[PDB]
Structure formats: C-alpha cells, structure tokens
Short mmCIF file of C-alpha atoms and ligand atoms in Angstrom, two decimals:
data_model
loop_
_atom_site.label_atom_id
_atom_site.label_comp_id
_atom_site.label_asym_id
_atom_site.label_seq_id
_atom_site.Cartn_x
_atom_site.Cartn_y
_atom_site.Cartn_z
CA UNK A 1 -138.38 -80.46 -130.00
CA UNK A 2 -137.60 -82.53 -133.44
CA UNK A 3 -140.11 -81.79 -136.19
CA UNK A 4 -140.99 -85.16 -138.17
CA UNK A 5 -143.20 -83.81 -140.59
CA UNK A 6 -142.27 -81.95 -143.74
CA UNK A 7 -144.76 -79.82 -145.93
CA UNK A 8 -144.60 -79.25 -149.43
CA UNK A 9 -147.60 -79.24 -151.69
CA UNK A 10 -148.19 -76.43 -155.00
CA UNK A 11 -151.14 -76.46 -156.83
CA UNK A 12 -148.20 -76.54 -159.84
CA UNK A 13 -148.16 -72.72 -160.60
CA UNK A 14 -144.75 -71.15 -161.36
CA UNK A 15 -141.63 -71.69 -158.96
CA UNK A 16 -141.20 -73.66 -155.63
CA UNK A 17 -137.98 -74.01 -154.78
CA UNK A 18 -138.42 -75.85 -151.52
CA UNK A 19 -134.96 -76.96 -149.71
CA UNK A 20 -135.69 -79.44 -146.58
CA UNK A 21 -132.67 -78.71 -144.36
CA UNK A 22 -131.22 -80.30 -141.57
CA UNK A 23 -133.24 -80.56 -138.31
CA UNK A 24 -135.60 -77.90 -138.08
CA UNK A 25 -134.34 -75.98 -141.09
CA UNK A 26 -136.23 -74.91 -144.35
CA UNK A 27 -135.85 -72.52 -146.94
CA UNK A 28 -138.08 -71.33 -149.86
CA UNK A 29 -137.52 -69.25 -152.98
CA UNK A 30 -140.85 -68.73 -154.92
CA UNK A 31 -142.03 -66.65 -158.30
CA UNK A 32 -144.99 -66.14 -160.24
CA UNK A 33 -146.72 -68.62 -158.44
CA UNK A 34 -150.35 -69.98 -157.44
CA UNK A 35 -151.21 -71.59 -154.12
CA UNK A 36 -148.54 -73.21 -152.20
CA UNK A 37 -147.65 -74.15 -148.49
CA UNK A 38 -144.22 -74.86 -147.14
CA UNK A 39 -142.96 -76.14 -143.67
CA UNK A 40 -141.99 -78.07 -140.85
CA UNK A 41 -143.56 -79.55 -137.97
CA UNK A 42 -145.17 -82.28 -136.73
CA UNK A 43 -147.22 -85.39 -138.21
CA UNK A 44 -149.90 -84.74 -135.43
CA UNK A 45 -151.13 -81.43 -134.31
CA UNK A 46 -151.28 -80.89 -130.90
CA UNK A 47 -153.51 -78.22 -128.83
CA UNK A 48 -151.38 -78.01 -126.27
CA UNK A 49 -148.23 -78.03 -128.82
CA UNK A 50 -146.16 -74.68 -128.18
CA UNK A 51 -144.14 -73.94 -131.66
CA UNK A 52 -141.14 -71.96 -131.75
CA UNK A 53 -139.48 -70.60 -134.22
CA UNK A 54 -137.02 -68.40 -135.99
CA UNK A 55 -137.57 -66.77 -139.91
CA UNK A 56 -133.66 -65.99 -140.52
CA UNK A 57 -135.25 -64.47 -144.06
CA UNK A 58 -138.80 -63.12 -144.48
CA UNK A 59 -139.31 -61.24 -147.71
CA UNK A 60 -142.11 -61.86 -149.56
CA UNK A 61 -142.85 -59.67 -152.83
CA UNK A 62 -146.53 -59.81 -152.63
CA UNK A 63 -149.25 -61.85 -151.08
CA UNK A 64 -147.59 -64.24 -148.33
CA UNK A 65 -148.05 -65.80 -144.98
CA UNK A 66 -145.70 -66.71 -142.60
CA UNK A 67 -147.99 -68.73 -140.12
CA UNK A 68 -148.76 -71.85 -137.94
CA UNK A 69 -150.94 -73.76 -140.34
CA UNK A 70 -153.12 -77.48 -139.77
CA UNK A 71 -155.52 -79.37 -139.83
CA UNK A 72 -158.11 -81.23 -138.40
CA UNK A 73 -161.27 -84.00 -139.51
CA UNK A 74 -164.91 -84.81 -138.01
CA UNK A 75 -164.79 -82.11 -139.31
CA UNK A 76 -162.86 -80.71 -141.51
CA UNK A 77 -161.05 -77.07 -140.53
CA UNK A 78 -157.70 -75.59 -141.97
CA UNK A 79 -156.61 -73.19 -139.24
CA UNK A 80 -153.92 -70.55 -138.92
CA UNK A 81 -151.85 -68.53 -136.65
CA UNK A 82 -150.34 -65.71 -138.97
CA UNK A 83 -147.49 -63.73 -137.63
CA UNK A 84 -146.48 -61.73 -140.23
CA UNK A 85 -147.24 -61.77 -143.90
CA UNK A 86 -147.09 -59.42 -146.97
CA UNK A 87 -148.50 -57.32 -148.89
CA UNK A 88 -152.43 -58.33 -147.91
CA UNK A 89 -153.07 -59.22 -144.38
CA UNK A 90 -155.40 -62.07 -144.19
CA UNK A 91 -159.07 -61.09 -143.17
CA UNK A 92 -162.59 -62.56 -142.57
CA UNK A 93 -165.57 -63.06 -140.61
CA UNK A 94 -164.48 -60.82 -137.14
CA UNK A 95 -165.28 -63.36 -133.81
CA UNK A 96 -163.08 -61.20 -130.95
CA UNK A 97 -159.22 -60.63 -130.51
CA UNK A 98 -156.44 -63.18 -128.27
CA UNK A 99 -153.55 -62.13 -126.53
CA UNK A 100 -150.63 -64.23 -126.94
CA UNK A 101 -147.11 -64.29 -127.09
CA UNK A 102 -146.50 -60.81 -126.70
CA UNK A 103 -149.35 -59.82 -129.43
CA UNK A 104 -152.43 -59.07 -129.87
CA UNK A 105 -154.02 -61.39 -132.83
CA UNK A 106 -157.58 -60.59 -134.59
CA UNK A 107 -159.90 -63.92 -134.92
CA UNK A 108 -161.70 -64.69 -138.43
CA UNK A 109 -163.73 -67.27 -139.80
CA UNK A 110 -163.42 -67.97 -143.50
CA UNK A 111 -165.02 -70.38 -145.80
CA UNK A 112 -163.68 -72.04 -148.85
CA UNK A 113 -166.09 -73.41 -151.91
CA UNK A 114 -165.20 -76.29 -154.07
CA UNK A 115 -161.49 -75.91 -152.72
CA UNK A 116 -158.80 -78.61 -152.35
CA UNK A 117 -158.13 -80.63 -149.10
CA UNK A 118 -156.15 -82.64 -147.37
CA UNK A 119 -158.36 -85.35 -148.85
CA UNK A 120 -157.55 -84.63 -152.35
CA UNK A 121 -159.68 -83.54 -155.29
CA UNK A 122 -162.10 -80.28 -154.26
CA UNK A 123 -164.41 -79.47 -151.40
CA UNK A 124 -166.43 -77.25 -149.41
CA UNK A 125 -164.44 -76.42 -145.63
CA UNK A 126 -164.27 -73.54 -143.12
CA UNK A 127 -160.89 -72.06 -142.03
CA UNK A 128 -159.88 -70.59 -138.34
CA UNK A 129 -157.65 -67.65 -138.31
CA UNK A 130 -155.36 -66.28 -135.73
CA UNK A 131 -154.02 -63.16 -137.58
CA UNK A 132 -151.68 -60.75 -135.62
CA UNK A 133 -153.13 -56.84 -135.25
CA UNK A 134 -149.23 -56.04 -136.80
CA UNK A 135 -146.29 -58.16 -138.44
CA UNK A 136 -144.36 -59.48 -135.68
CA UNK A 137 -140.66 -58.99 -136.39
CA UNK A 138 -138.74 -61.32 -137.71
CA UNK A 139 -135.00 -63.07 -136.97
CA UNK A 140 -135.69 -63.31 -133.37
CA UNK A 141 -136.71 -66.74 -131.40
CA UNK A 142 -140.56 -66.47 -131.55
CA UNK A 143 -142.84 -68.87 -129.77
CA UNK A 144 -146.36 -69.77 -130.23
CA UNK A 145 -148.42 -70.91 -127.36
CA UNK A 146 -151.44 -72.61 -129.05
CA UNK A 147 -153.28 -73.56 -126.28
CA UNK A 148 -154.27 -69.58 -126.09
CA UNK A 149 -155.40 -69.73 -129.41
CA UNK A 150 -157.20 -73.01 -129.67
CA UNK A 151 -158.92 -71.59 -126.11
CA UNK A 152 -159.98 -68.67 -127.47
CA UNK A 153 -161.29 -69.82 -130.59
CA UNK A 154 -163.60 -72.49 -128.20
CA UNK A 155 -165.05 -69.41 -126.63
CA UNK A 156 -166.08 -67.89 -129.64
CA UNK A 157 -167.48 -71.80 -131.03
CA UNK A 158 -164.85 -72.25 -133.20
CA UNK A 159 -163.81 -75.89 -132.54
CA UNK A 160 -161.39 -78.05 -134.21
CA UNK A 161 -162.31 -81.87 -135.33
CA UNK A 162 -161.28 -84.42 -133.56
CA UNK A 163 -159.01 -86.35 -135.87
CA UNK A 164 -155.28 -83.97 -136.18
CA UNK A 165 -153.46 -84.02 -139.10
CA UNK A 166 -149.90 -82.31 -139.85
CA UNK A 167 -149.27 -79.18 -138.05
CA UNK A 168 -146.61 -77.23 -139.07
CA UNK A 169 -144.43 -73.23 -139.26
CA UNK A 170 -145.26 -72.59 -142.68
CA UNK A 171 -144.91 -70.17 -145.93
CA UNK A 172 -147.90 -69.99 -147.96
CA UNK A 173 -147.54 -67.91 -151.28
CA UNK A 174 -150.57 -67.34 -153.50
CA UNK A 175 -149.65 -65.38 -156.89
CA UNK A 176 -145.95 -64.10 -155.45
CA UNK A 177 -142.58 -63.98 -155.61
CA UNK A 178 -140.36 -64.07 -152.52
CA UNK A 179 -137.79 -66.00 -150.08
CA UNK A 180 -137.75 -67.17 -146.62
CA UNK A 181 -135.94 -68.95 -144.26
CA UNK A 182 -137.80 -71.01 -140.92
CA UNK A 183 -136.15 -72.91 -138.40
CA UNK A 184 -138.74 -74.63 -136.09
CA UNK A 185 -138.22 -76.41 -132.92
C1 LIG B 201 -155.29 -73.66 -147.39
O1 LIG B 201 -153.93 -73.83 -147.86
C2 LIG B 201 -153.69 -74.43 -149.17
C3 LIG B 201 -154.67 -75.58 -149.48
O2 LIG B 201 -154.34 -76.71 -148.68
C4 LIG B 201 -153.70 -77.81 -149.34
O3 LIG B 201 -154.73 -78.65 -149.91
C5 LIG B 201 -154.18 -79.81 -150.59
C6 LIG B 201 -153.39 -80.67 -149.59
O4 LIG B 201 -152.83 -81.80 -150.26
C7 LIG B 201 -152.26 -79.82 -148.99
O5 LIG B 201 -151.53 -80.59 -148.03
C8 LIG B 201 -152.87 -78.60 -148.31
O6 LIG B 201 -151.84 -77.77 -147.78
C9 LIG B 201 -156.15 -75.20 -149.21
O7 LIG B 201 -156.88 -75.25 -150.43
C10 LIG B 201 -156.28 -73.81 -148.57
F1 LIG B 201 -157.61 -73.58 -148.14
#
C-alpha cells in the first residue's frame, strides 16, 4: 500500500536529519539528540492494518527504536510494536507475551507524567508496548500483522481509544547518535 502520512517531530535537541523519500522511502541521520520520532505511514491507524517493511540501514549508536508507533484518543494511548532497537530494550509493566510474525514479543504497560502529546503542550498518558523477546534482523521484507497485537493486548485490558491518529514504521532516538533507512508499504 501507499503511505500518506509522514512523521517528523524533535523535541529540538541536537541533529535530525530527516530525508522524506519517494514512496515509501525515509532515511534518518541523528546525533547528540533528545526525543525524536521519524516515519511513514498512514494518517489513520488501522487495527486490522498489516505494515510491512524493510530497514535497508539500522545502526543506532545508543538508545533507539525501530518500531510501529500511534496513537489513539477517548483516551489517550501511544502504543508500540518494537522490532529491534539499541542499546536499551524498551521495558515496563509485564501483562503476557504474543506471537506474531515469526516472533515472540513481550507486552508492557508504561506511563508517562507531565509528557508531551499529540495534543501539544504536556500531559499525563499510558503507553502499550509490543517489544520483541530479540532484535529481529534487519534488510529483509518484514511484516507486521497488528491485528495479533491489538488482540492480544484486549485480552490482557489494554484497549486503544476510539478516535486513531497517525500510525506509522518509525525511528525514535532519545539521547543518540545513529542512521537508518525504512521503506514501508
Ligand atoms: C512517545 O514518543 C515521543 C512523544 O510523542 C510526540 O509528542 C508530540 C507530538 O507532536 C508528536 O507527534 C509525538 O510523536 C511522546 O512524548 C512519547 F511518550
């Protein structure tokens, strides 16, 4: 499928050097950064959406995701599906494990305080996470079946809101360096 969203939002620490490409193609070089989040996808997140993708270049030089990232309002959840990352693999709350794609991904529940939002400015919001048990390897056509994730994550009462935002394949960096290189479909 076309993507028709593109990501792109730093809370202004260091270097972003976020190229859209053509179609499904993006590329990011970052250093000495704070919080950012990088991608491609779609304008409205789907549960039944299955992403695929392909990171041609995944080396991050400290703390990075590469991930399906969203959102959602009524209420308001920032959820992940993290595939690989690198040097800290994201952690929380433990709720069960999912089997998808091939892998076998851990389920967390996180909360942020006085963070920002979609919204803007700062506020108080819980975060789903899909984090693989190990990276899964990169350069190869990877898919992403959602609709096992957003399942499992209904058994465990972790559901989304009911108003989607964006959903994209992105590269978050928090306090890193690194490169990579997504093409989503
Ligand atoms: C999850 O990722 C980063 C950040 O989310 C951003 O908040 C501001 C908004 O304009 C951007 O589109 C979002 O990506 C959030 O604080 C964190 F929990």
């Amino acid at each position: 499928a076309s993507t028709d969203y593109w990501q792109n939002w730093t809370d202004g620490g260091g270097i972003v050097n976020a190229v859209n490409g053509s179609g499904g193609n993006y590329s990011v070089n970052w250093s000495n950064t704070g919080d950012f989040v990088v991608g491609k996808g779609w304008t409205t997140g789907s549960p039944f959406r299955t992403i695929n993708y392909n990171a041609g270049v995944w080396a991050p030089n400290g703390n990075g995701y590469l991930t399906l990232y969203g959102w959602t309002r009524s209420p308001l959840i920032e959820y992940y599906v993290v595939d690989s990352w690198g040097t800290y693999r994201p952690t929380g709350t433990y709720k069960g494990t999912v089997k998808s794609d091939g892998g076998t991904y851990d389920i967390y529940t996180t909360t942020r305080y006085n963070a920002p939002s979609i919204d803007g400015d700062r506020t108080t919001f819980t975060q789903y996470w899909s984090v693989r048990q190990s990276k899964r390897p990169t350069g190869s056509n990877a898919t992403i079946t959602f609709t096992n994730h957003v399942n499992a994550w209904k058994s465990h009462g972790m559901n989304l809101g009911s108003n989607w935002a964006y959903q994209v394949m992105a590269t978050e960096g928090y306090q890193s360096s690194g490169s990579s290189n997504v093409t989503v479909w």
